[PDB]
């Protein structure tokens, strides 16, 4: 399952 | 044996041609099992392996919502990195990210990965400690400072030691008849004369899974690394892979050459020669 959406670069 | 789960993200800008495309694919070992494409008429995480189809709607909805959020986050990120490198609005650029976990025969975490690239060059990578960062340049140091401030490393480690390992274990069990099955290569040696002085011996490996394999030529028992032409391992389309190794040998010295095949589907490694 995908990782939770993280911080923008 | 050991297993891996990896997700591969590609975000590509295309100025004058709409908003950046975001594509995600998930693998277990060498088996793709999901995909998402922001260019689809109706983008969703979609199944690509039979053993994932049984997952319930909450699974598909969660993976879809995260990917849709990631589409926006990666568009913002492409804008940010364009600024970091003082780049024009007219150029197309690519962020790539690969992350995941390796586990051992007992399902214990071996290590985690989270690496990012910009236009095909290393940009930022989570270190093996799952706690610190390696930034390739002063632009990536800007990302590093954002991510330290948002405690990203803790969240990536939590995923890598938690969900990544637990879901990889679940997939391995649900797909055990394929994911935990190693198919050995079918092998043979062909002979292609070049002239009256030389011929090509080609050692073939077909139908094997997983992709990892070693094919080597020996002359009088000495590895011919320098002289062996290795083709890149290639997918057959049916989950299996193909590869060959070739060497140019003097006419009449063919029996001095042996091909050696190692693969985890093979009880014992193989020694092959040309059988005329």
């Amino acid at each position: 399952t995908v990782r939770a959406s993280g911080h923008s670069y | 044996g050991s297993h891996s789960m990896r997700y591969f993200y590609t975000a590509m800008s295309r100025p004058g041609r709409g908003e950046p495309r975001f594509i995600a694919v998930g693998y277990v070992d060498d088996t793709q099992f999901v995909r998402f494409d922001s260019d689809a008429a109706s983008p969703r995480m979609a199944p690509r392996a039979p053993w994932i189809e049984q997952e319930g709607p909450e699974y598909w909805d969660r993976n879809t919502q995260i990917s849709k959020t990631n589409t926006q986050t990666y568009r913002e990120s492409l804008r940010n990195l364009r600024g970091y490198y003082n780049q024009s609005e007219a150029g197309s650029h690519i962020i790539q990210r690969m992350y995941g976990c390796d586990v051992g025969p007992d399902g214990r975490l071996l290590r985690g990965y989270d690496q990012s690239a910009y236009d095909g060059k290393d940009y930022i990578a989570l270190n093996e400690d799952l706690s610190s960062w390696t930034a390739a340049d002063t632009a990536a140091q800007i990302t590093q400072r954002k991510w330290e401030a948002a405690r990203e490393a803790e969240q990536l480690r939590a995923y890598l030691e938690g969900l990544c390992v637990e879901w990889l274990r679940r997939y391995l069990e649900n797909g055990k008849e394929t994911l935990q099955r190693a198919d050995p290569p079918k092998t043979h040696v062909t002979h292609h004369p070049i002239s009256d002085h030389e011929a090509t011996l080609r050692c073939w490996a077909l139908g094997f899974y997983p992709a990892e394999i070693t094919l080597t030529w020996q002359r009088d028992g000495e590895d011919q690394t320098q002289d062996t032409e290795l083709v890149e391992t290639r997918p057959a389309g049916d989950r299996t892979f193909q590869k060959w190794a070739a060497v140019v040998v003097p006419s009449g010295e063919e029996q001095r050459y042996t091909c050696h095949v190692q693969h985890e589907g093979l009880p014992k490694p193989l020694t092959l020669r040309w059988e005329p």
């Binding site: - | 591969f8 590609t10 590509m12 594509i23 690509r48 790539q96 236009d119 997918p235 057959a236 389309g237």
Partner: protein, 99 residues
Amino acid sequence: MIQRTPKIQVYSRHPAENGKSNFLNCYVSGFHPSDIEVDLLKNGERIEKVEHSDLSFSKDWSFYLLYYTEFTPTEKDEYACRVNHVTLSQPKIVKWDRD
């Protein structure tokens, strides 16, 4: 900015024998950036119905794609793959060699 030209391999899924239905494969790998045009040619004419894998990339960040279509080899028919990429002055043709 650095670009990498595609490697191209053209081959069948199973060992080719005239009259037996097979799959024709064009595998493009090692390239950057990701936009690429690939067609399978039967005697010079583009084949419709050609499918391809989902975009992914290797450890060195270069992209790879498999293009494929079901087909049935004969001794007459010539097959080839045509590849266009930003690194290529003109499309590259690679003929299906059977050996």
